[PDB]
Amino acid sequence: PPTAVTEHDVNVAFQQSAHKVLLDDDNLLPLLHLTIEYHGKSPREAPASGWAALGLSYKVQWPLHILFTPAVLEKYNV
Amino acid sequence: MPREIITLQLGQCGNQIGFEFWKQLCAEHGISPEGIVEEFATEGTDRKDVFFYQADDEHYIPRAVLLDLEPRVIHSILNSPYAKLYNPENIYLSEHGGGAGNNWASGFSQGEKIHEDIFDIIDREADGSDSLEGFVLCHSIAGGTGSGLGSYLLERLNDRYPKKLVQTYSVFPNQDEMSDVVVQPYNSLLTLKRLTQNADCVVVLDNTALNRIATDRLHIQNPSFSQINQLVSTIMSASTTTLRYPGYMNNDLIGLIASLIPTPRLHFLMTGYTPLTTDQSVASVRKTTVLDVMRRLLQPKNVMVSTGRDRQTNHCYIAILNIIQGEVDPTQVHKSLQRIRERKLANFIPWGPASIQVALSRKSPYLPSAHRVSGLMMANHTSISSLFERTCRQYDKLRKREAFLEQFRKEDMFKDNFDEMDTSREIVQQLIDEYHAATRPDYISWGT
Amino acid sequence: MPREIITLQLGQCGNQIGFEFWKQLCAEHGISPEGIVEEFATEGTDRKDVFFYQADDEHYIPRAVLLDLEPRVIHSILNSPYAKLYNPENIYLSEHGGGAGNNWASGFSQGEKIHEDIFDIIDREADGSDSLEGFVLCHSIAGGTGSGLGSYLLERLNDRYPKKLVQTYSVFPNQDEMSDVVVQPYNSLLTLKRLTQNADCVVVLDNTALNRIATDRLHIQNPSFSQINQLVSTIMSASTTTLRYPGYMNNDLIGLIASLIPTPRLHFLMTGYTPLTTDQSVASVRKTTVLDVMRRLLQPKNVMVSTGRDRQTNHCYIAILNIIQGEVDPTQVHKSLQRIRERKLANFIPWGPASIQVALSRKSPYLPSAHRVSGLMMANHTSISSLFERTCRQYDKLRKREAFLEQFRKEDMFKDNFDEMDTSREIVQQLIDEYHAATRPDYISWGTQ
Amino acid sequence: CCGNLMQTLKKDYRLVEYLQAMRNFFLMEGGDTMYDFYTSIFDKIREKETWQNVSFLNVQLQEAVGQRYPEDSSRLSISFENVDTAKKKLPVHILDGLTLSYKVPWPVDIVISLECQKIYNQVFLLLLQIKWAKYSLDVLLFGELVSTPVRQQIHRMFLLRVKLMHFVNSLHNYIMTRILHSTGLEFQHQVEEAKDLDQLIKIHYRYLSTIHDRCLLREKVSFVKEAIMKVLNLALMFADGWQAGLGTWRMESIEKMESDFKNCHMFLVTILNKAVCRGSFPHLESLALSLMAGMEQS
């Protein structure tokens, strides 16, 4: 089940793999944020496994945020 | 981290294949002969770390091990412009330079003599690999060095790396040419034994098939060994493009090969290449569609494996994977699969679900591709048994003729008997029969 | 005030190294061959008093001491354009000019003969030094003059400045070339004895390792002693840039060296330099990142020490200090350290916490830097024992044959016996064992009786 | 009008020179002169000399500044108040009685307000305390420890001192480069972008607020400030034992100091972990990671 530290650990693991995969785009990695659930417990979203709690956040820059509407981002996340 | 692949080039034929493979890989990745990425190779989209190691932030060195029992070939490789491309710490060369004398038993004994040095090299390369998938061995099964040393190396790798994957690029002897190595079937038998017992997948490279393709398809009147090695390196490059250009699927070698080998014995793969053109026929870029591509691929002239015509067994494909590179329309791929099934252009196993897998892959960005669309076919086809049956027949003919066994009896592995060759021949016969069964519906009950 | 450093050049090799160092320092600081600051040296941010003294209102003289037992090298230095760079009152030259005959003991006896002059030179440099930290000795360990003079200088520095630190730039014998001086291992042993007992830090410069690095990194097939001295001078300049360009870190010698020497016995340092470029490859200013810099530094071809591949001992770095010069982003340094740890680019001691320290320093403003970013690596690595083990094996090979020992037997220190050499061999053996132990968790008890 | 005003402020009021001086003094950018100053102070403390003398401290400060920064030497003034060492057990905290004052000219004194001067002085004092701890750890001479007969215990104590020094140096470097140097570069860039005097004042106030946050001066970091003070007191006791040498520091006392250091380090790590998990100081995670970077997991 996901923990409050698991989100940080997962984002760190993603950055570490990116560097290992030589994905050195420091502009994309900060725009990409991995979401998970709080260890405290929806309550976290009470994911039975960390895989269920994994989400992606993307920093849309202006003016392109007009294109990546919240519903579009939600569909992309689904 | 990438799943690093160590390339092992063994004996004269294997070392030539390895050298041409490294040349092709360097050309595809835009790596200078010293292992440095060329300034024009600014497209960092290739995955060198799968097959190459970085010497610096810019210089990629192939994770390749060049192994010979004779110093002439290793020195000739070290005398090429690409001598500095490979990491020298991954190169183990036999000091005696005498080779194995085309004796498999001698090659195995030499491997045992170089066991410490070879395993030190292997361990050093493994420690330099963050997430090593396995080793790729390039060798001939007919000689002494590439064959005997290949069997010894396979045994020692299985003992030392029992949890690591072992893929081989095994150059099989030409079966249409009379081999001067009368003990080649013994060498071939030992290599097939080691692949059966200690390898998980054996990629068969038939020098007979290479010569046949060069003559009939490449319009090469006298195919050089170098030209065959360059064709093999091109084929390997096409097979590795999807590894070098990461995507949604087939992101690892084991993930790619898992679908092709249903059983540990069913590790005999057939190859196909696209676009297939005669050396003279490079000129006309045909706007081939995925349906047209598959149709040309379905022509035996476009398959990168020359399997004999078995007339007795209704040989069929066990599985097919098509890796297509270049501009591909998905609707054309769908129509291609539809037409192939409708036209029954391939016979599949009747005992289980079977299809032609299709992979679309990017081309290396550092290598300019002259072809809009390229393709690799990987297939498991029962007609490969006709090659295996021919190898078995040659093995039986040599054992029944005791041909060249006196030279093997000089080496400890074959000093007292050739029983390992006869057991290998029997295992290969059982393998041929099983491959024939896999062409049949009774494969569902095979091994029950 | 600057912590002044006296540079001691000992024997032929040491004096050549000192001469090339003074030439390079003068060029980097805009100091004329006469000791005058060039008009282009407008950056008054450098601490000349650390390395130079003022001889007159216009001439800055390096705090450099040129010491030889043979007059040829001292005369050649005094015949160079840099003759006026060094303070002449800090230069002691043996009147007899005969050298030590490749005998460390002879060099020591000559030092005793020049003891008064040498200590007068040292005191003159100390009075010219506002905040003298200690002495820097440049010498070869394989000869007689540089080795014996180095042992004498170490003894006299320990006697006069027993509470002050003594760092040395010690040129170690080439281990890949067969030395014609069969007693060089005896000379090397006596020099190691003096470094262990009377020096506080010995930087080993192996001419074989220098040649190997020149081949692999500078693409120099045969590094000359002059070329090695110029490379060493470049390294010293980079190490003194933080003295000449004061910054957040390494503003003092003790602050710089404190992180490198965990125990008094673990005083054998390995060095690294960055960027390492071949003379032809200066052309392309590569936008190297801190990660890229560290990766190039991590290349053995860029390490200025050729440690053998010990297959039996899992040699590791005891400590690493990275001195980075040039434009450095702190976030880039942090990410670089993170990636280095994640990539396990350095093996640490198993008996204690160890890491690669990274210091960012400004470059000297008076020296135009061709590189946006430059770097020094200081490392303590257990694989240096393989150099020490090789030196011990060479000593045993020479001592067991008593080869060329008659030249040392001419000098009183080795006239009756070689007990100083045997004690040196025993101390070096214990040091090698501890360095191998220092790669192991049992280093906590290493060196305990 | 604002462009002309900004030009006048830059040219006539030496604003860039004032910012460079601020870096030199409050951020101890004059590392050589401030190093010699703090070294003389730490030597006086080690010699148990009276360093808390405002006249002696001011004389030494004026000499140090006049040697290297004579123009700034007339604007910088240092006072020393005797810090009650019984309350401030950390030797770095002995300097807390020091009050540095800088003569800011008009109209620049409008920018360097008494509250701005107070914040600058707090930063200078923090830097001085860090430098004092640094020198105290660096000035530990091995010859001072050589007197004790327990070679194995002496070596273990030396290695523990080395480890503690490495940890403290990592924290100091984090503060100087990742906090102080990075924030200095950011401040310089913002000052370059400063369009008006009110904008410049706001930039300076933002810089000061950012420093105060990174200096754990915010209530939200009060627990972190206290943990840092505890670690500094442990470091000061370790430095005192190092200066007394192993002859005075017995193996039982060396082991006790090592145990206390390990316990303080564990407590600090747990506090940092709780703060990172709270997300309140995610940048400190990099500082926390750096302090745990290269430290063996004891």
mmCIF file of N, CA and C in Angstrom, chain B residues 223-277:
data_model
loop_
_atom_site.group_PDB
_atom_site.id
_atom_site.type_symbol
_atom_site.label_atom_id
_atom_site.label_comp_id
_atom_site.label_asym_id
_atom_site.label_seq_id
_atom_site.Cartn_x
_atom_site.Cartn_y
_atom_site.Cartn_z
ATOM 1 N N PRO B 223 30.731 -14.848 -52.789
ATOM 2 C CA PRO B 223 30.573 -14.166 -51.498
ATOM 3 C C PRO B 223 31.798 -14.374 -50.622
ATOM 4 N N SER B 224 32.400 -13.270 -50.198
ATOM 5 C CA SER B 224 33.491 -13.361 -49.246
ATOM 6 C C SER B 224 32.946 -13.658 -47.854
ATOM 7 N N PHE B 225 33.806 -14.234 -47.009
ATOM 8 C CA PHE B 225 33.437 -14.382 -45.606
ATOM 9 C C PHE B 225 33.137 -13.019 -45.005
ATOM 10 N N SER B 226 33.890 -11.999 -45.428
ATOM 11 C CA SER B 226 33.675 -10.649 -44.922
ATOM 12 C C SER B 226 32.302 -10.135 -45.329
ATOM 13 N N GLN B 227 31.876 -10.432 -46.559
ATOM 14 C CA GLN B 227 30.571 -9.970 -47.018
ATOM 15 C C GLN B 227 29.451 -10.667 -46.259
ATOM 16 N N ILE B 228 29.625 -11.957 -45.970
ATOM 17 C CA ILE B 228 28.642 -12.675 -45.165
ATOM 18 C C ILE B 228 28.596 -12.097 -43.759
ATOM 19 N N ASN B 229 29.765 -11.802 -43.186
ATOM 20 C CA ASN B 229 29.812 -11.216 -41.851
ATOM 21 C C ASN B 229 29.159 -9.840 -41.833
ATOM 22 N N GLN B 230 29.332 -9.063 -42.904
ATOM 23 C CA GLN B 230 28.694 -7.752 -42.984
ATOM 24 C C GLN B 230 27.184 -7.876 -43.135
ATOM 25 N N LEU B 231 26.720 -8.887 -43.869
ATOM 26 C CA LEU B 231 25.285 -9.139 -43.949
ATOM 27 C C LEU B 231 24.734 -9.533 -42.587
ATOM 28 N N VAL B 232 25.470 -10.374 -41.863
ATOM 29 C CA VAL B 232 25.041 -10.800 -40.536
ATOM 30 C C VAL B 232 25.007 -9.609 -39.589
ATOM 31 N N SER B 233 26.014 -8.741 -39.673
ATOM 32 C CA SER B 233 26.038 -7.547 -38.840
ATOM 33 C C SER B 233 24.873 -6.622 -39.164
ATOM 34 N N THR B 234 24.533 -6.485 -40.448
ATOM 35 C CA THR B 234 23.355 -5.707 -40.816
ATOM 36 C C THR B 234 22.088 -6.319 -40.231
ATOM 37 N N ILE B 235 21.993 -7.649 -40.257
ATOM 38 C CA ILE B 235 20.822 -8.323 -39.704
ATOM 39 C C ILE B 235 20.741 -8.093 -38.201
ATOM 40 N N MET B 236 21.874 -8.225 -37.514
ATOM 41 C CA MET B 236 21.918 -7.986 -36.077
ATOM 42 C C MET B 236 21.533 -6.551 -35.755
ATOM 43 N N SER B 237 22.032 -5.599 -36.543
ATOM 44 C CA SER B 237 21.665 -4.200 -36.361
ATOM 45 C C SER B 237 20.159 -4.014 -36.486
ATOM 46 N N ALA B 238 19.562 -4.588 -37.532
ATOM 47 C CA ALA B 238 18.118 -4.466 -37.693
ATOM 48 C C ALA B 238 17.381 -5.098 -36.519
ATOM 49 N N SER B 239 17.889 -6.223 -36.014
ATOM 50 C CA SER B 239 17.262 -6.868 -34.867
ATOM 51 C C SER B 239 17.424 -6.053 -33.590
ATOM 52 N N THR B 240 18.480 -5.253 -33.500
ATOM 53 C CA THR B 240 18.763 -4.464 -32.310
ATOM 54 C C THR B 240 18.274 -3.027 -32.403
ATOM 55 N N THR B 241 17.710 -2.624 -33.542
ATOM 56 C CA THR B 241 17.251 -1.245 -33.677
ATOM 57 C C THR B 241 16.189 -0.920 -32.636
ATOM 58 N N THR B 242 15.263 -1.852 -32.396
ATOM 59 C CA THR B 242 14.229 -1.631 -31.394
ATOM 60 C C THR B 242 14.808 -1.590 -29.988
ATOM 61 N N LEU B 243 15.981 -2.187 -29.781
ATOM 62 C CA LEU B 243 16.666 -2.053 -28.505
ATOM 63 C C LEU B 243 17.339 -0.696 -28.404
ATOM 64 N N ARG B 244 17.832 -0.184 -29.529
ATOM 65 C CA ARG B 244 18.555 1.077 -29.537
ATOM 66 C C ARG B 244 17.597 2.251 -29.599
ATOM 67 N N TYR B 245 16.383 2.030 -30.099
ATOM 68 C CA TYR B 245 15.337 3.048 -30.148
ATOM 69 C C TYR B 245 14.217 2.582 -29.229
ATOM 70 N N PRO B 246 14.264 2.961 -27.952
ATOM 71 C CA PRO B 246 13.301 2.433 -26.978
ATOM 72 C C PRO B 246 11.875 2.843 -27.314
ATOM 73 N N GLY B 247 10.938 1.933 -27.062
ATOM 74 C CA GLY B 247 9.539 2.256 -27.249
ATOM 75 C C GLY B 247 8.600 1.594 -26.263
ATOM 76 N N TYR B 248 7.326 1.490 -26.649
ATOM 77 C CA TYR B 248 6.297 0.971 -25.754
ATOM 78 C C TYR B 248 6.477 -0.516 -25.487
ATOM 79 N N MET B 249 7.045 -1.249 -26.435
ATOM 80 C CA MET B 249 7.107 -2.697 -26.369
ATOM 81 C C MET B 249 8.527 -3.126 -26.687
ATOM 82 N N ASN B 250 8.853 -4.356 -26.290
ATOM 83 C CA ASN B 250 10.120 -4.983 -26.653
ATOM 84 C C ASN B 250 11.272 -4.092 -26.204
ATOM 85 N N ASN B 251 11.145 -3.566 -24.988
ATOM 86 C CA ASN B 251 12.117 -2.651 -24.413
ATOM 87 C C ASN B 251 13.301 -3.381 -23.809
ATOM 88 N N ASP B 252 13.270 -4.708 -23.813
ATOM 89 C CA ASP B 252 14.346 -5.523 -23.284
ATOM 90 C C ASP B 252 14.520 -6.726 -24.194
ATOM 91 N N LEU B 253 15.741 -7.257 -24.216
ATOM 92 C CA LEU B 253 16.021 -8.404 -25.068
ATOM 93 C C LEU B 253 15.240 -9.628 -24.616
ATOM 94 N N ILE B 254 15.168 -9.860 -23.305
ATOM 95 C CA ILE B 254 14.429 -11.014 -22.803
ATOM 96 C C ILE B 254 12.940 -10.865 -23.078
ATOM 97 N N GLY B 255 12.401 -9.652 -22.926
ATOM 98 C CA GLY B 255 11.023 -9.425 -23.323
ATOM 99 C C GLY B 255 10.787 -9.661 -24.799
ATOM 100 N N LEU B 256 11.770 -9.328 -25.633
ATOM 101 C CA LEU B 256 11.635 -9.554 -27.067
ATOM 102 C C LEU B 256 11.675 -11.041 -27.403
ATOM 103 N N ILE B 257 12.608 -11.772 -26.794
ATOM 104 C CA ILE B 257 12.844 -13.173 -27.131
ATOM 105 C C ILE B 257 11.919 -14.136 -26.400
ATOM 106 N N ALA B 258 11.326 -13.718 -25.280
ATOM 107 C CA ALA B 258 10.444 -14.610 -24.535
ATOM 108 C C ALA B 258 9.311 -15.134 -25.407
ATOM 109 N N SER B 259 8.713 -14.268 -26.227
ATOM 110 C CA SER B 259 7.593 -14.699 -27.053
ATOM 111 C C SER B 259 7.998 -15.696 -28.131
ATOM 112 N N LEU B 260 9.287 -15.802 -28.454
ATOM 113 C CA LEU B 260 9.695 -16.634 -29.577
ATOM 114 C C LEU B 260 10.025 -18.063 -29.171
ATOM 115 N N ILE B 261 10.398 -18.285 -27.915
ATOM 116 C CA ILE B 261 10.890 -19.584 -27.466
ATOM 117 C C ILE B 261 9.886 -20.177 -26.486
ATOM 118 N N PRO B 262 8.906 -20.953 -26.952
ATOM 119 C CA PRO B 262 7.896 -21.460 -26.009
ATOM 120 C C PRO B 262 8.443 -22.489 -25.037
ATOM 121 N N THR B 263 9.329 -23.370 -25.494
ATOM 122 C CA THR B 263 9.934 -24.383 -24.646
ATOM 123 C C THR B 263 11.453 -24.298 -24.709
ATOM 124 N N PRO B 264 12.148 -24.768 -23.667
ATOM 125 C CA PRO B 264 13.616 -24.663 -23.670
ATOM 126 C C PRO B 264 14.240 -25.346 -24.867
ATOM 127 N N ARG B 265 13.595 -26.390 -25.383
ATOM 128 C CA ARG B 265 14.112 -27.089 -26.548
ATOM 129 C C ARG B 265 13.778 -26.327 -27.820
ATOM 130 N N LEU B 266 12.641 -25.631 -27.830
ATOM 131 C CA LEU B 266 12.188 -24.884 -28.998
ATOM 132 C C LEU B 266 12.877 -23.518 -29.055
ATOM 133 N N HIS B 267 14.209 -23.564 -29.081
ATOM 134 C CA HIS B 267 15.032 -22.363 -29.057
ATOM 135 C C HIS B 267 15.709 -22.127 -30.400
ATOM 136 N N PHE B 268 15.227 -22.790 -31.447
ATOM 137 C CA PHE B 268 15.763 -22.639 -32.793
ATOM 138 C C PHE B 268 14.933 -21.580 -33.507
ATOM 139 N N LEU B 269 15.547 -20.440 -33.791
ATOM 140 C CA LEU B 269 14.857 -19.320 -34.409
ATOM 141 C C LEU B 269 15.198 -19.244 -35.889
ATOM 142 N N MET B 270 14.209 -18.867 -36.690
ATOM 143 C CA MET B 270 14.418 -18.526 -38.087
ATOM 144 C C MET B 270 14.348 -17.014 -38.233
ATOM 145 N N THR B 271 15.035 -16.496 -39.243
ATOM 146 C CA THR B 271 15.111 -15.061 -39.438
ATOM 147 C C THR B 271 14.507 -14.656 -40.773
ATOM 148 N N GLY B 272 14.107 -13.398 -40.823
ATOM 149 C CA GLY B 272 13.648 -12.777 -42.050
ATOM 150 C C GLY B 272 14.085 -11.335 -42.037
ATOM 151 N N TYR B 273 14.313 -10.791 -43.222
ATOM 152 C CA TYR B 273 14.797 -9.430 -43.361
ATOM 153 C C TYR B 273 13.955 -8.677 -44.376
ATOM 154 N N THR B 274 13.816 -7.376 -44.140
ATOM 155 C CA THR B 274 13.088 -6.495 -45.036
ATOM 156 C C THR B 274 13.662 -5.096 -44.884
ATOM 157 N N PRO B 275 13.667 -4.301 -45.958
ATOM 158 C CA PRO B 275 13.288 -4.748 -47.299
ATOM 159 C C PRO B 275 14.395 -5.626 -47.852
ATOM 160 N N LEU B 276 14.022 -6.695 -48.547
ATOM 161 C CA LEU B 276 14.986 -7.527 -49.249
ATOM 162 C C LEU B 276 15.161 -7.002 -50.664
ATOM 163 N N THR B 277 16.403 -6.694 -51.010
ATOM 164 C CA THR B 277 16.760 -6.195 -52.324
ATOM 165 C C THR B 277 18.012 -6.919 -52.784
#
